[PDB]
Write a protein that binds this ligand. Structure first.
Ligand SMILES: Nc1ncnc2c1ncn2[C@@H]1O[C@H](C[C@@H](N)CC[C@H](N)C(=O)O)[C@@H](O)[C@H]1O
Ligand SMILES: Nc1ncnc2c1ncn2[C@@H]1O[C@H](C[C@@H](N)CC[C@H](N)C(=O)O)[C@@H](O)[C@H]1O
Lengths: 230, 247
């Protein structure tokens, strides 16, 4: 069913800039790239334009058909560089390994906690040694802000100072679309720091976290996370 | 080892050698909830047996027992149950006999008994990840009698207390708090002391409204949510949630 918000029928771009941010933090890419939950190629087409060879993994049959149709419209050199694969980013086996594994924010926020461990484990099995796992992650106002530290003085007779902070971990992005004269959606919104803690917990060293602007200009509303297997 | 907080980092540099970094839940030279217990009592008003989940060493249980309540207290840790059993042995035989102690996992438990009231505290539900909480909710449903209540206390952070900020554009967007990490750093008000022990800890801190969404999704009707102060006065730092099975 639909979500009845406080101000309420449910609600259900260009990846050139986001794609380039990925290309900056990989450097030179010897070998094919695995993109997880590729959708209809919002990022995959920009990746192919960088000359990459991409294996694009997507769960939906319907979304795959849209992707395949788009590929048929592309020049032969583009299409020839894209291998489409039906699969589940939280649990896949292609038997092959890759120098680079890529996932966008819209995709990782699709997975709950247990499914994310599925994802992390699967990526470990598909990275060649010295391989790079790259993630973009949306960063909310709360996730970017320094947490407000609270102080309290407390006795017993021995006096103590208690400091408390609250670190962002997960929010819900709630939407209400409106004819200005009733559409609705709640989605998960992980703090990049949360995903990074999860990455470390699951085996990775996180070597860089670079904020960037998704649309290539203005406020930096995303983070590129580079993770590697030690 | 322990969580090395930003404030801990700078203290330990500034203290040189007197300084030791510890987690709050270990070597601890550093419990009363008669007021939280009263919030529960105030929102029950009782027919029969009460199930208390993750009862710990009875910080709420003993207060409940003092009200005439028959309490089943469920706890996972055997050492904690041992310490509960000791306290319960030093208690008047009227208190001692209205208390049943059971070892169990509040995420997947099963008793040969149903209850008019089931209670859990914030400290406790935040013990559980998302999957385990679903296990909790399902298990609780199975232990409620017709018309029985599930009562939860939930700590409420500043971000959880605020009305989420909107950005009108018409497009209404809100970011609702779901889960935070509560991070503490505790040290003596002095600086000498010796040893200078800095105590840190990180725990899960769910938004009361997130738990409410989760309860509703699990098949409960949430029929009230009441903010209250855990120290009977000051900022209301806690919410009392009441849930029932729709009949
Ligand atoms: N478990 C899963 N495995 C693989 N793909 C998934 C899974 N769950 C959801 N998806 C897909 O993840 C995608 C998420 C979308 N936001 C599209 C992302 C796409 N990279 C884009 O930029 O538009 C959808 O295309 C879903 O069909
Ligand atoms: N899965 C579980 N089932 C039952 N008890 C648990 C579980 N996980 C943790 N605990 C206990 O939950 C308690 C949490 C504590 N904050 C104590 C709660 C107690 N009501 C008090 O106010 O002191 C500890 O006693 C843990 O041993």
């Amino acid at each position: 069913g639909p979500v009845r918000t406080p101000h309420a029928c449910d609600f259900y771009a260009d990846g050139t800039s986001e794609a380039r941010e990925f290309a900056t933090r990989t450097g030179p890419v010897s070998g094919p790239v695995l993109e997880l939950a590729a959708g209809m190629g919002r990022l995959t087409f920009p990746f192919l334009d960088l000359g990459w060879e991409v294996t694009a993994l997507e769960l939906s049959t319907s979304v795959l058909a849209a992707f395949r149709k788009r590929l048929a419209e592309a020049p032969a050199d583009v299409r020839d560089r894209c291998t489409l694969v039906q699969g589940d980013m939280s649990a896949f086996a292609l038997d092959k390994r890759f120098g680079t594994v890529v996932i966008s924010s819209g995709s990782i926020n699709e997975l709950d906690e247990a499914d994310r461990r599925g994802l992390y484990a699967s990526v470990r099995e598909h990275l060649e040694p010295g391989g790079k796992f790259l993630l973009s992650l949306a960063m909310s106002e709360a996730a970017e802000s320094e947490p407000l530290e609270r102080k309290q003085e407390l006795p017993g007779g021995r006096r103590y100072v208690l400091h408390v902070r609250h670190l962002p971990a997960e929010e819900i992005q709630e939407i209400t679309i409106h004819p200005a004269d009733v559409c609705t959606h709640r989605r998960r919104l992980l703090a990049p720091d949360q995903v990074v803690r999860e990455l470390v917990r699951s085996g990775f060293d996180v070597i860089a976290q670079t904020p960037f602007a998704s649309g290539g200009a203005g406020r930096k509303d995303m983070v590129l996370v580079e993770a590697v297997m030690p």
